[PDB]
Design a protein around this ligand. Structure first.
Ligand SMILES: [Zn+2]
Ligand SMILES: [Zn+2]
Lengths: 67, 97, 144, 115, 148, 257
């Protein structure tokens, strides 16, 4: 759904690195370079951002139950 | 030939008896003819059992299922009582029979 | 089928095979750690197979403590070639195959499904028949 | 629904004693130490500190079951040297070792920062 | 005393068939004097050994060698009996069988010793006159020391 | 029968990482110090969460779980703060807990990122590691989120939210000389960062008399406790556990004798 903070394997904070990763992907960098620029050296951390899918955007399309 | 060599207990050798049996029992085995008669009767009964087995088991299948493992407890008796095969035994064959 | 149905299976069996070889040698602390998981252990640490320069036990030496009472059994490892029984090294086993357990002590050999597994004449079968169900239960648990 | 509370590996509730000593009758001058609600972190620590003692003949730790929180430590020493005294000496030894290590680490960090 | 066998051996072979165990090799040794054929499994990494080295092989029923039994227990605090420590490599094991060439009438002129050192096995062939000290199911110590 | 003297050198020390080597010490003490890094180090993290209104597309305990994993700066006041179990007061008091208040409503059409910045604490010492921003939930126009949370003191044994450290890299004997692990083909194994041998050779020659020493460490903090405070509090906590064991053992010995 949403980017999970605290990478499961080790515990490094990755909940704040999703928007920056998206920006780096959108502008110049490939996924490997974007992850390297974010300081994710252990592949357990890189799998969190790389394999993440963000359904939170899809869930926001629907109108809220209360306006 | 092998059956006779393995199960007869040839007492005539007077050297194998000294090697395997105690010195005291060798004279008892040789002197008394009743010992030899009982031993020959045992061998005759064993030969009859051999014939019965060959009637019962064609094709020579020697693997059979039986209640207690004779060889295993013979080995257990050897180890429990610290039996030394290098030395002559003190067991009288008539006592075995 | 007059065989044991339970047997040392899967992970414990593979580790038994890797632990029963001549190659394994255990230091002092590892020996202590292994010994405390033996429920029927009498509390006497066996003298290591190697004493000098440093005391090293062997996998067979420690496993012999697990074997209950005085169990006598002869098996063959799965690797056992048929040439060994004919020629020399019949009782020396250069590949350390075959199994000889004498007076309840693992003297030589590699244990596998042919020894601790569910088969007729297996080491566990001999343990059940000679000793009894209660002690064989502890034998199973201690091995595991 | 059967999940135990998270605070059962360190918390001692009413009734259990933190440590328990039971003498081992199989061999002379050997005791059994049972530590409740505790795991390998110190089990291995006293196991290894005991082996440093030349007067300890047997030393170790084990966990009877991982789902339960308990350590059984068995210590066997030489005659005329109680295993309880050896266990106490090992704990004090580890305390001194940790204090010295902490002091040295503080010295090293002071050297590394602006130094 | 408590000494069962004493001789100097030379290593003729290491792996006649191959390297079955990385840490354990099989010393195929021929002896001087007594002409004692020896096959021995020796841990290698702890005690290295190559071809053609003179080593003193000693088989003793006890290590104290003052004539007292060792009760078969490991106690590192047993230095005070002045244990025989002249040898670099020391093993403890159990002889499991004695094989010979005797057949019925005539006696055994040559015997072979089968000793298991907790898995490491050894064969010791030769004339039975000096090998008669071995008895099946008896504790045996193996002592080794390299020579120049 | 006495302590060997351990020595420590610090190779790298940053705000997120400390790399130190412990020498002349036992393997078990190194391993226990490593385990205390993860388990026994106290830290402040959110435990008690109460939600007043939750209009987000994420349900209540989902955002509560995300809040609990948010690291909190506890570099100083974690020691003075007491466990809620041992605290005299019922529920929570400032001497046993820290209050966090969250209040976000999305009025503009664009999605609002509810971040760790929006968490408001009563005391200025515990900031959720914001001197980017940890994302709690996203809100579309019309959605609202208001909650009150209390942060307690705990350690890694209780829950992973109380883990003060990221992956703790522990390593001893880089060039395998003790043969604790046997490489079937040593030539294909990459040399460790701390390897001291030349490139051509693969392993150091076996050392029969050697024992594990020179335990290389790499403690990476998660941002809550600065990395050196993690190891300092770890040593202190292990010593405290040993001392409590000593006290209980002494009492037991006097009682039984
Ligand atoms: Zn990670
Ligand atoms: Zn309070």
């Amino acid at each position: 759904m949403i980017i999970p903070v605290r990478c499961f394997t080790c515990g490094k904070i990755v909940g704040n690195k999703w928007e920056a990763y998206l920006g780096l992907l959108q502008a110049e960098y490939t996924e490997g370079d974007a992850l390297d620029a974010l300081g994710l050296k252990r592949y357990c951390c890189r799998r969190m951002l790389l394999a993440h899918v963000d359904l939170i955007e899809k869930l926001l399309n629907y109108a809220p139950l209360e306006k | 030939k092998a059956f006779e060599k393995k199960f007869r207990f040839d007492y005539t050798n007077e050297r194998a008896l000294r090697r395997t049996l105690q010195e005291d029992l060798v004279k008892d085995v040789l002197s008394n003819a009743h010992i030899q008669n009982e031993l020959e009767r045992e061998f005759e009964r064993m030969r009859e059992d051999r014939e019965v087995l060959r009637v019962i088991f064609p094709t020579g299948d020697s693997k059979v299922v039986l209640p207690c493992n004779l060889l295993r407890m013979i080995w257990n008796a050897q180890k429990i009582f610290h039996i030394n095969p290098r030395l002559p035994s003190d067991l009288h064959p008539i006592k075995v029979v | 089928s007059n065989r044991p149905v339970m047997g040392i299976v899967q992970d414990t069996l593979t580790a038994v095979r890797k632990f029963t070889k001549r190659d394994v040698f255990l230091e002092r602390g590892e020996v202590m750690n292994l010994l405390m998981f033996l429920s029927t252990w009498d509390g006497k640490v066996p003298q290591p197979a190697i004493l000098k320069p440093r005391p090293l036990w062997t996998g067979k030496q420690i496993f012999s403590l697990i074997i209950p009472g005085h169990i006598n059994c002869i098996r063959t490892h799965s690797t056992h070639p048929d040439d060994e029984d004919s020629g020399p090294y019949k009782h020396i086993s250069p590949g350390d195959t075959k199994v000889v357990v004498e007076n309840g002590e693992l003297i030589m050999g590699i244990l596998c499904k042919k020894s601790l597994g569910t088969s007729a004449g297996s080491l566990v079968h001999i343990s059940y028949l000679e000793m009894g169900h209660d002690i064989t239960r502890l034998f199973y648990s201690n091995i595991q | 629904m059967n999940a135990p509370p998270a605070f059962e590996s360190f918390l001692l509730f009413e009734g259990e004693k933190k440590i328990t000593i039971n003498k081992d009758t199989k061999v002379p001058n050997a005791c059994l130490f049972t530590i409740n609600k505790e795991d390998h972190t110190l089990g291995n620590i006293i196991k290894s500190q005991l082996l440093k003692d030349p007067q300890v003949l047997f030393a170790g730790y084990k966990v009877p079951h991982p789902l339960e929180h308990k350590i059984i430590i068995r210590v066997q020493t030489t005659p005329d040297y109680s295993p309880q005294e050896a266990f106490t000496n090992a704990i004090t030894d580890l305390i001194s070792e940790l204090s010295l290590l902490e002091e040295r680490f503080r010295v090293a960090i002071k050297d590394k920062q602006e130094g | 005393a408590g000494i069962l066998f004493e001789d100097i051996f030379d290593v003729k072979d290491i792996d006649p068939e191959g390297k079955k165990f990385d840490r354990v090799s099989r010393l195929h040794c021929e002896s001087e004097s007594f002409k004692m054929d020896l096959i021995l499994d020796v841990n290698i990494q702890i005690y290295p050994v190559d071809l053609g080295d003179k080593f003193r092989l000693v088989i003793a029923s006890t290590l104290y060698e003052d004539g007292t039994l060792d009760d078969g227990e490991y106690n590192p605090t047993d230095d005070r009996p002045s244990r025989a420590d002249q040898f670099e490599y020391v093993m403890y094991g159990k002889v499991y069988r004695i094989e010979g060439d005797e057949t019925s009438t005539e006696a055994a002129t040559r015997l072979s010793a089968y000793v298991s050192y907790g898995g490491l096995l050894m064969r010791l062939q030769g004339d039975a006159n000096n090998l008669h000290g071995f008895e099946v199911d008896s504790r045996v110590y193996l002592l080794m020391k390299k020579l120049a | 029968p006495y302590a060997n003297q351990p020595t420590v050198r610090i190779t790298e020390l940053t705000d997120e990482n400390v790399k130190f080597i412990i020498e002349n010490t036992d393997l078990a003490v190194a391993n226990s110090i490593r385990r205390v890094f993860i388990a026994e180090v106290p830290i402040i993290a959110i435990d008690w969460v109460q939600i007043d209104a939750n209009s987000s597309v994420l349900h209540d305990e989902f955002i509560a779980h995300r809040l609990g994993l948010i690291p909190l700066i506890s570099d100083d006041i974690v020691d003075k703060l007491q466990y809620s179990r041992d605290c005299t007061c019922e529920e929570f008091c400032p001497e046993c807990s820290v209050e966090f208040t969250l209040d976000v409503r999305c009025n503009e059409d664009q999605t609002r990122h509810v971040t760790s910045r929006d968490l408001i604490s009563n005391s200025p010492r515990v900031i959720p590691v914001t001197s980017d921003d940890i994302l709690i939930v996203k809100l579309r126009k019309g959605q609202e989120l208001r909650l009150r949370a209390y942060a307690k003191k705990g350690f890694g044994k209780e829950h992973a939210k109380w883990n003060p450290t990221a992956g703790v890299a522990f390593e001893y004997d880089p060039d395998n000389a003790l043969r604790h692990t046997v490489y079937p083909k040593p030539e294909e194994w990459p040399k460790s960062e701390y390897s001291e041998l030349d490139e051509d050779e693969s392993q150091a020659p076996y050392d029969p008399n050697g024992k594990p020493e020179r335990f290389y460490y790499n403690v990476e903090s998660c941002g809550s406790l600065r990395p050196e405070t993690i190891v300092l509090s770890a040593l202190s906590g292990l010593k405290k556990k040993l001392s409590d064991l000593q006290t209980q053992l002494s009492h037991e010995i006097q009682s039984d004798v």
